[PDB]
């Protein structure tokens, strides 16, 4: 009766989901066929799959998912792939022509012919659901289709449903490594729409993920699927507290009312750990003390922005496993004293605690091993202004002489919208500077 609905748009979101939903299946024990393995279930989890699944009437199960992509290349592979029977056959909207990294293309001419189907599918999925708690949106902004569809879809969703909360796991361009050179334009355009419709967002830049992969798992040549696996783990840890018993539950509604000082500043950067393989762990640490220290380490952060360059506002840490309560207070007290990580003046108490019982679960044949507990942390610190500073510098240099402007201008997006986007982005950077001024 407390359920959620997932929104995935774009190839990046599709690939991340391909691992997120497989892990979701593995932890609750649901085969790809849609049939539960029995094995004397006798309702072992009983009322357990409501949070992410709904009854099919007799036997099988249908995940609450919606898939969107204008390019059928990945949609077909998912359809005929390892989970052929899982998703609703008609719930996978299939595109006809690729967006080809054109934000204007993805927002004003081709996008208008699929948002109707997206709204219809979302309406059908939600209405049957009883207690829709919010939205979970995965999208990519380093290209056309991702933003061009996601921003407009969220815009329509807000006017369709209103005050209902929403969370978004976007993927901004990395400081050094990226694919396209038109990525800055798409990021600048997408931030304009996303800064006033989404409440809680998380940056998951690829560069930090690669760094973390090199250091811990000792896999020098990581892959895209391996990168997606960690994001899937982060999502699972974030949403675990909503569907399992615990000593203190933190519902999805208790993030914005806990981790956003003002309506405008609503971007957070998070991390996950520990990250230890099945080879070099069992002879190791992971007493509860060291996990908390590893959480605040700068190099381990999931975004290429040093938290050491700014203060802190509020971070919510959710433990999963068998962590005894008092260990949490001990870890918090130890972390507070150290001078390396300091807080802003205006928030004396800025830690949220949540304890759940289910240990994190692992997928077969992965790089992750099984340990007895782990901690996932979400952080919003003034350092995050650096990433928006860097994305700022790139745009100005190549807009000085309207580089690649025509592909956007001739597609319908008025030339004046770039002015608005730049003005608003400049406004945002000013915003973060003042909050840190000491009292």
């Amino acid at each position: 009766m407390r359920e959620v609905i997932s929104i995935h748009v774009g190839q990046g979101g599709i690939q991340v989901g391909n691992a997120c939903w497989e892990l979701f299946c593995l932890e609750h024990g649901i085969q790809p066929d849609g049939q539960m393995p029995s094995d004397k279930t006798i309702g072992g989890g009983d009322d357990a799959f409501n949070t992410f699944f709904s009854e099919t009437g007799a036997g099988k199960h249908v995940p609450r998912a919606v898939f969107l992509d204008l390019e059928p290349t990945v949609i077909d592979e998912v359809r005929t792939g390892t989970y052929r029977q899982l998703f609703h056959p008609e719930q996978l909207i299939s595109g006809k022509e690729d967006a080809a990294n054109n934000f204007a293309r993805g927002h004003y001419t081709i996008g208008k012919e699929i948002v109707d189907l997206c709204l219809d599918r979302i309406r059908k999925l939600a209405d049957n659901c009883t207690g829709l708690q919010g939205f979970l949106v995965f999208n990519s902004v380093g290209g056309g289709t991702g933003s061009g569809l996601g921003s407009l879809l969220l815009e329509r969703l807000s006017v369709d449903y209103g005050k209902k909360s929403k969370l978004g796991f976007t993927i901004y361009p990395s400081p050094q490594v990226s694919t396209a050179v038109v990525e800055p334009y798409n990021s600048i355009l997408s931030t304009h729409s996303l800064l006033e419709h989404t409440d809680v967002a998380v940056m998951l830049d690829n560069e930090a993920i690669y760094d973390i992969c090199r250091r811990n798992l000792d896999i020098e040549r990581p892959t895209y699927t391996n990168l997606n696996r960690l994001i899937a783990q982060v999502i699972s840890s974030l949403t675990a507290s909503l569907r399992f018993d615990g000593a203190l539950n933190v519902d999805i509604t208790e993030f914005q009312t806990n981790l956003v000082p003002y309506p405008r500043i609503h971007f957070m950067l998070s991390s996950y750990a520990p990250i230890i393989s099945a080879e070099k762990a069992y002879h190791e640490q992971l007493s509860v003390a060291e996990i908390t220290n590893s959480a605040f380490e700068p190099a381990n952060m999931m975004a290429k922005c040093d938290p050491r360059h700014g203060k802190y506002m509020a971070c919510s840490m959710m433990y999963r496993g068998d962590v005894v309560p008092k260990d949490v207070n001990a870890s918090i007290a130890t972390i507070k004293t150290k001078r390396t990580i300091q807080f802003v003046d205006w928030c004396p108490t800025g830690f949220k605690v949540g304890i759940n019982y289910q240990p994190p679960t692992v997928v077969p044949g992965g790089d992750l091993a099984k340990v007895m507990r782990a901690v996932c942390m979400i952080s919003n610190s003034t350092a995050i202004a650096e990433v928006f500073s860097r994305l700022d510098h790139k745009f100005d240099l190549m807009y000085a002489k309207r580089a690649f402007v025509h592909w956007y201008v001739g597609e319908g997006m008025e030339e004046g919208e770039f002015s608005e986007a730049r003005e608003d982005l400049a406004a945002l950077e000013k915003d973060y500077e003042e909050v840190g001024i000491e009292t």
């Binding site: 080809a100 694919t179 396209a180 050179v181 800055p184 895209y224 240099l397 190549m398 580089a403 690649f404």
Partner: protein, 430 residues
Amino acid sequence: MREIVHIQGGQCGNQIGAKFWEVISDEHGIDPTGTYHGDSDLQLERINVYYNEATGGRYVPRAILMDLEPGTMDSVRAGPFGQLFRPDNFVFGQTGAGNNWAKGHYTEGAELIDSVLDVVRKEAEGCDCLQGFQITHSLGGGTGSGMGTLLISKVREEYPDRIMETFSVVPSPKVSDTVVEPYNATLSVHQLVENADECMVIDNEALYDICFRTLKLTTPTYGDLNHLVSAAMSGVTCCLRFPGQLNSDLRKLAVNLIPFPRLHFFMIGFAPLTSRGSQQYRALTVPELTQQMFDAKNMMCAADPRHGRYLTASALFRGRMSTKEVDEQMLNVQNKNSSYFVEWIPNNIKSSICDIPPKGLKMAVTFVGNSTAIQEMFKRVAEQFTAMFRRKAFLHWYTGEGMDEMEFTEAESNMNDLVSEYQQYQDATA
């Protein structure tokens, strides 16, 4: 879905197309008889891209074979895989070209173009949805440049929203092939810019240079030269026929490779290409393989790239490669050679991945680059035209079939404009 039509023109083109269909037939596994003998399941999911379907289970390339002399078309039919082409897809005249522009674009070509124009439209509407255009022709030749370009303008007229590409063997003065080459070349480049979106030149001079230096076969012949260029376009459309991590259609290159509406000249290259005697000795790693791609002599165009600075680059890695190696290698190449890339555009190396590599290799890279070094190519062609034009030589044929020097004057104007404008950015600073 998103199938692409293929257009052929001129003798130079006719040799490209026939061999081009050589490589695709095997990979899809369609034999000389048109029957299927594939091995992998993933080989049919997108067979419709280049091949239609017909009764009896046989497949035919959706091609257009077109030239003004019967002898040229005779060879393709009688040669290998000459049985894959529908007879209705052939159009030919009876008079020949004789290396005269006017005979190709105003008088002789016009009377027969209507027949050629009608054919394309019927095939174009048959497919579910057009995705683009590819034209195989030549500029230094007789029939192609004149009668081929006209079909470029005509096709672009009715279909303003479809993007297109072009393959052309621009001539090199060293290995001369015709005295009248400067005319039919500069005259051709004039009209190509205004309508042709994507054009990637291929220089025959590099073919010998690439063949003897790296291939180093005893006596390379026209069979092999056309073959290496064949793979170039085989992998250009890689994302469309196979799944992959980051699919990239033709237009993605268009958005990411043409900073301005007119500056649409690309130089391509292929790798790896190793001799018959060094086949088994080189390691197969992104590091070693990527070194060849940006090498000065691996480029497929006579223009030396190190003489100028690049603007944008996109290379489509084919086969199972660890992306991180692709990403990391990109950073290193962009840092140790900063002086050869324009500063004002940051993060100017594109990347792409695919699942299925060409048969017989686990790595394969098709490098498409937009470098300022192409100006010397036009400069070399342009300078000869001004010298020889002043004397009015070879001018009585052209003026006698509907060509007026008042037109020729404009042509040189356009060539210089591109030559002058192109080099503004090379010295431009932020």
